Amino acid sequence: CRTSCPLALASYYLENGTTLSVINQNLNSSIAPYDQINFDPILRYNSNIKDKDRIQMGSRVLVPFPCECQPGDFLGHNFSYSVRQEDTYERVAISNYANLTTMESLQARNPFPATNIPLSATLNVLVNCSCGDESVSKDFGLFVTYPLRPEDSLSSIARSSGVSADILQRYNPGVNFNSGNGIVYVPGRDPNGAFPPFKS
Numbered sequence: 001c002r003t004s005c006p007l008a009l010a011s012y013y014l015e016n017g018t019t020l021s022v023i024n025q026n027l028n029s030s031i032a033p034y035d036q037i038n039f040d041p042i043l044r045y046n047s048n049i050k051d052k053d054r055i056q057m058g059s060r061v062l063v064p065f066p067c068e069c070q071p072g073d074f075l076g077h078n079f080s081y082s083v084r085q086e087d088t089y090e091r092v093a094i095s096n097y098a099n100l101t102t103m104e105s106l107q108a109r110n111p112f113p114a115t116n117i118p119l120s121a122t123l124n125v126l127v128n129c130s131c132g133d134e135s136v137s138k139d140f141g142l143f144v145t146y147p148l149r150p151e152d153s154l155s156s157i158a159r160s161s162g163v164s165a166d167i168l169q170r171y172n173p174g175v176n177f178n179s180g181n182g183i184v185y186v187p188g189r190d191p192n193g194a195f196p197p198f199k200s
């Protein structure tokens with residue numbers, strides 16, 4: 001890979017009842033180790049969360065995770081997921097991982113036929129990330145993998161991220177930020193609200 005960085009952030013949209021524990025379980029990693037007791041690694045990136053035990057539907061939770069070079073020379077991370085009753089690749093992608101992965105990606109990289117995924121199988125779940133692009137800006141080196149929703153637009157994400165629309169578009173060239181699907185990469189802040197800069 002041409003770029004590298006020590007972490008990325010995943011944007012997990014809340015619907016149908018998701019708790020912080022389930023997010024931490026699904027997105028467990030060395031960077032956010034799930035122990036059911038200490039959620040500080042996640043909470044540091046979400047100062048807006050007043051009560052970790054009662055999170056608000058319709059909001060997004062930012063989760064830090066490692067951002068590693070993958071075969072095929074792109075950046076991402078392999079999460080692991082223990083299969084539960086009635087899981088399907090579609091449901092795991094759209095619901096359990098909140099569009100941070102795709103059903104096609106899951107099906108390609110796991111050996112279970114779509115119609116036979118047994119209880120307690122483990123899935124390899126790929127979520128992509130970015131470390132930035134020096135030709136766009138030297139000012140950003142931490143990125144949110146942000147699945148687009150119908151309510152998002154370039155202007156709304158620019159406003160909420162505090163990053164200019166032109167910079168956002170240059171990081172995501174040719175991508176319509178109002179399309180309501182797929183992922184865009186948005187510069188993110190450290191726990192104190194500063195943007196970590198790009199690092200070669």
Ligand SMILES: *[C@@H]1O[C@H](CO)[C@@H](O[C@@H]2O[C@H](CO)[C@@H](O[C@@H]3O[C@H](CO)[C@@H](O)[C@H](O)[C@@H]3O)[C@H](O)[C@H]2NC(C)=O)[C@H](O)[C@H]1NC(C)=O
Nearest residue numbers: 067068069070071072076077078079108109110124125126
């Ligand atoms: C994330 O998980 C995936 C799936 O378990 C890992 O995938 C695979 O990685 C290995 C190399 O680490 C690749 O095996 C290699 O295959 C090539 C040719 O196919 C062969 O010449 C090598 O000797 C080696 O056996 C495999 O192709 C690759 N598969 C895919 C789908 O990309 C991946 O490595 C994990 N990422 C990390 C950072 O560990």
Ligand SMILES: *[C@@H]1O[C@H](CO)[C@@H](O[C@@H]2O[C@H](CO)[C@@H](O)[C@H](O)[C@H]2NC(C)=O)[C@H](O)[C@H]1NC(C)=O
Nearest residue numbers: 025027028029030031032033034035036079080
């Ligand atoms: C969360 O993910 C991490 C990273 O994959 C897991 O880390 C392993 O932890 C065991 C026991 O502490 C170590 O022996 C391994 O060396 C770690 N693996 C790696 C690759 O670092 C961790 O166990 C996971 N936690 C849960 C609840 O699944």
Ligand SMILES: *[C@@H]1O[C@H](CO)[C@@H](O[C@@H]2O[C@H](CO)[C@@H](O)[C@H](O)[C@H]2NC(C)=O)[C@H](O)[C@H]1NC(C)=O
Nearest residue numbers: 012013014015093094095097098099149180181
């Ligand atoms: C992941 O994306 C899917 C597809 O856009 C979202 O599910 C759609 O949600 C709308 C309601 O908002 C429904 O009308 C569609 O029928 C759904 N499509 C499918 C295929 O189920 C889903 O909400 C997204 N997940 C998250 C957590 O945001």
Ligand SMILES: *[C@@H]1O[C@H](CO)[C@@H](O[C@@H]2O[C@H](CO)[C@@H](O)[C@H](O)[C@H]2NC(C)=O)[C@H](O)[C@H]1NC(C)=O
Nearest residue numbers: 071072073074076100101102104105126127128
């Ligand atoms: C993560 O990024 C990789 C690399 O761009 C994506 O992999 C490609 O996926 C497309 C569509 O399925 C395939 O046509 C290509 O063969 C893949 N390229 C490589 C190098 O594997 C991948 O789809 C992205 N994953 C997610 C979950 O967004």
Ligand SMILES: *[C@@H]1O[C@H](CO)[C@@H](O)[C@H](O)[C@H]1NC(C)=O
Nearest residue numbers: 014015016091094095096098
């Ligand atoms: C939420 O539940 C409804 C009703 O079952 C379903 O249509 C929708 O797909 C669910 N959303 C997610 C994220 O799976």
